[PDB]
Each structure stands twice: as structure tokens, then as C-alpha cells.
Amino acid sequence: TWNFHQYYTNRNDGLMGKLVLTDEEKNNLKALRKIIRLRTRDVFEEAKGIAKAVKKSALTFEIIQEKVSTTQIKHLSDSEQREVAKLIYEMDDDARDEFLGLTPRFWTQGSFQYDTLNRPFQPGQEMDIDDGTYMPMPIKIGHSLLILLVDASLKSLVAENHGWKFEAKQTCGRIKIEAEKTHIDVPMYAIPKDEFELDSENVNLALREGDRKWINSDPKIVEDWFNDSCIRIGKHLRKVCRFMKAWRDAQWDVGGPSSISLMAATVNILDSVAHDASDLGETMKIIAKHLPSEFARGVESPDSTDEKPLFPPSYKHGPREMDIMSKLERLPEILSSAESADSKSEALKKINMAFGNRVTNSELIVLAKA
Numbered sequence: 001t002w003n004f005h006q007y008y009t010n011r012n013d014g015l016m017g018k019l020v021l022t023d024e025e026k027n028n029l030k031a032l033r034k035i036i037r038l039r040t041r042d043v044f045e046e047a048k049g050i051a052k053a054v055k056k057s058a059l060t061f062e063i064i065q066e067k068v069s070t071t072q073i074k075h076l077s078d079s080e081q082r083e084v085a086k087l088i089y090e091m092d093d094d095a096r097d098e099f100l101g102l103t104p105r106f107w108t109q110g111s112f113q114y115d116t117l118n119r120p121f122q123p124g125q126e127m128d129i130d131d132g133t134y135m136p137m138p139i140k141i142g143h144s145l146l147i148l149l150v151d152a153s154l155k156s157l158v159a160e161n162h163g164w165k166f167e168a169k170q171t172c173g174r175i176k177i178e179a180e181k182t183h184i185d186v187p188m189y190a191i192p193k194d195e196f197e198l199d200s201e202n203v204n205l206a207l208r209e210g211d212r213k214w215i216n217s218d219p220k221i222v223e224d225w226f227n228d229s230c231i232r233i234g235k236h237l238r239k240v241c242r243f244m245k246a247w248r249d250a251q252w253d254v255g256g257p258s259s260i261s262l263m264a265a266t267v268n269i270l271d272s273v274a275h276d277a278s279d280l281g282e283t284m285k286i287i288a289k290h291l292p293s294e295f296a297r298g299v300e301s302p303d304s305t306d307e308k309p310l311f312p313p314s315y316k317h318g319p320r321e322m323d324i325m326s327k328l329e330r331l332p333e334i335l336s337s338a339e340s341a342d343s344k345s346e347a348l349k350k351i352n353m354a355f356g357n358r359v360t361n362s363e364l365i366v367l368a369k370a
């Protein structure tokens with residue numbers, strides 16, 4: 001019988017050592033994020049610079065379009081630029097006044113915010129940094145204008161860098177850097193101006209496509225929920241969540257259960273089942289043992305304003321969810337097979353069936369005390 005605690009927790013050779021980013025990479029992501037923010041604010045200042053000229057005197061739509069064609073907004077399509085000119089020109093004094101006082105704000109969400117960002121494993125997998133852009137508006141400024149300006153910022157940054165690519169997503173604009181295994185998501189929110197924690201009921205997420213242009217979604221709910229869960233459960237929650245995410249990354253090159261569903265399920269389990277934090281191999285064994293049941297009945301979002309769960313119950317499972325249940329069902333067998341191995345190296349080889357050949361030091365495993 002073996003102990004796998006150091007295998008998990010060692011900050012040099014252990015799984016944690018392989019998953020956590022170095023201060024360098026962390027700073028490279030903060031640098032990329034700062035770049036995106038600076039560009040967004042500059043593009044907004046240029047558009048506001050145009051609109052102030054519109055307010056200061058009647059400017060034909062051609063002139064307004066000539067001014068747009070000289071700003072960073074020139075990195076949009078000709079039709080898109082024309083659209084920006086239209087929306088700026090068709091603004092009534094009121095909306096224009098609310099636009100001239102709009103300075104965008106920024107707040108990061110996701111793994112980079114609550115410290116669960118793993119180093120990617122398989123090719124195609126990249127570091128995900130989600131930096132949300134917030135728009136202090138009353139209650140309103142054009143949804144199309146805002147989306148177009150943030151798109152103009154991102155594309156203006158892509159036009160300055162070899163290897164960068166722009167991708168349009170439903171909830172966000174994205175800048176992809178394949179060569180550096182990195183991508184930055186920029187979701188956009190509308191928030192009450194005067195108020196600007198903050199009343200969730202008014203934090204609206206912008207949608208790119210569909211009949212619905214906005215939907216009430218506050219990321220501070222998930223961030224606070226997970227932080228609270230971390231305080232309540234302990235320091236090991238973040239670790240085992242990192243381990244579960246690494247397992248997901250090792251079993252699927254692309255796809256698998258969402259990180260947030262693994263997080264919610266892991267939290268539920270560590271909230272309802274007794275475990276020992278001084279031994280994360282035992283804890284991981286218990287978690288693996290209880291996860292299939294948690295996913296089978298469905299995983300409800302820690303956000304009650306979500307109509308749909310993070311993972312649906314079994315009677316709705318299709319090929320995808322049945323595949324996820326197959327691997328979730330396969331994990332405990334792997335941890336048990338590794339637990340009862342004949343040698344250190346055999347146990348390593350067996351547990352690396354679950355986390356991949358990332359930990360190579362078999363000396364991190366030890367014989368369990370009596």
C-alpha cells in the first residue's frame with residue numbers, strides 16, 4: 001500500500017510543481033492583459049474623440065467616416081467601420097453625452113482570478129485568461145457600438161503581432177496566440193453607472209448572436225462562491241481542483257467536462273464527505289469515488305440565476321455525457337490500481353494513467369505507515 005501525497009503536493013517534482021505556472025508566465029499573462037486593456041481604452045478614447053467633434057459641430061456622415069478610417073477602428077472591415085460611423089452619427093444628444101462620459105473598466109475572471117490556472121498538457125491546449133470589460137451605463141449605449149469597439153481593439157492588436165489571431169465567440173471576443181499556448185477572452189458587461197460589491201441583478205453579459213443581446217450574468221457570483229468554498233473547506237480545495245482539471249486535460253486533448261462543473265462537484269463532495277487534507281492521495285481517492293454519482297444526478301451551478309446546470313442528469317445524457325461518465329467511472333479504478341502496485345515505479349506508471357506522464361519522480365511516492 002502506497003502513499004501519494006508528495007506525488008500530488010511537491011512544488012518542484014510533484015503534480016502541483018508541474019501544473020502551477022512560474023512567476024515568469026504569470027507575469028507574461030498579466031502583461032498581455034495590460035496590453036489588451038490599454039488598447040481598449042485607447043480605441044474608446046478615439047471614438048469618443050470623434051463623437052465629441054460631432055457634438056461640437058454638425059459633421060457630415062462622410063467626415064465622421066473619414067475620422068473613423070484614421071483611428072485604430074481602421075482594423076475593422078469596411079462595412080464594420082461604416083457601421084461605427086453610422087452609429088456615432090445617428091446618436092441623439094442624450095446617448096452621445098452618456099457615451100462621452102463612458103470609460104471602460106476591467107476585471108479578470110476564471111482560473112487566473114481564483115488561482116486554478118494549470119499549465120496545458122496536450123497539444124492544442126492553451127492557457128486561458130478571461131479579462132472582462134465593463135461598461136458603466138444607466139438603467140444605455142448601443143450594443144453594436146460597444147461590441148464593435150472592443151472588436152476594433154482586439155483586431156488592432158492582432159494586426160500588430162505575427163502569430164496572433166482574432167476569434168469571435170458568443171460570449172466574448174478572443175485573441176489567440178497558438179505559438180505561446182495562450183489565449184485571452186474578453187467578455188463584455190453592462191453595469192449600472194451610478195452604483196459604480198455590486199448588485200448582480202444589473203450585471204448584464206453581452207451576447208454576439210441571437211435574439212437576445214444581453215443576459216443577467218455576474219462572474220463575481222462564481223468567484224465569491226469558489227473563494228468562500230476555499231475558506232470553508234481549506235487550502236487543499238484549489239489543489240484537488242487543479243488535479244481534477246489536469247485529469248480532464250490528460251483524458252481529453254479537447255473536450256471533457258467543464259472546469260467549473262468539476263469545481264462545483266469537488267466542492268460538494270468535500271462539503272459532504274469526511275476527508276484528511278494531510279493526505280491528498282486519500283482525498284483524491286474519495287473525490288474520484290464520489291464524482292460519478294455527483295455527475296450522474298446532474299451538477300447544479302452555484303449561480304441560482306442559471307436555468308441550466310453545469311452537467312445534466314443521467315436521463316438526458318447523450319454520447320458526450322456518457323463518455324464523460326465512462327472516464328469518471330474509470331478514474332477510481334486507476335487510483336486503486338496505482339495504490340496496490342508492487343513497486344514505486346509501477347505505482348507511478350499506473351497513476352500516470354490518470355494524470356499523464358508529467359510527474360517522473362517515483363521517489364515522491366512512499367510506503368504508507370501502519
Ligand SMILES: Nc1nc2c(ncn2[C@@H]2O[C@H](COP(=O)(O)CP(=O)(O)OP(=O)(O)O)[C@@H](O)[C@H]2O)c(=O)[nH]1
Pocket residue numbers: 109110111112116117118128130217218219220222223259260301303306310
Ligand atoms: N454563471 C456561470 N458562469 C460561467 C459558466 N461558465 C463559465 N462561466 C464564467 O466564465 C468564467 C471563466 O470561464 P472558463 O470556461 O474559462 C472556466 P475556468 O477559467 O475557471 O477554467 P480554465 O479556463 O479551463 O482554467 C468563469 O469564472 C465564470 O465566471 C456557467 O456555466 N455559469
Ligand SMILES: [Mg+2]
Pocket residue numbers: 109110111112128129130
Ligand atoms: Mg479562465
Ligand SMILES: [Mg+2]
Pocket residue numbers: 110128129130185
Ligand atoms: Mg475562457
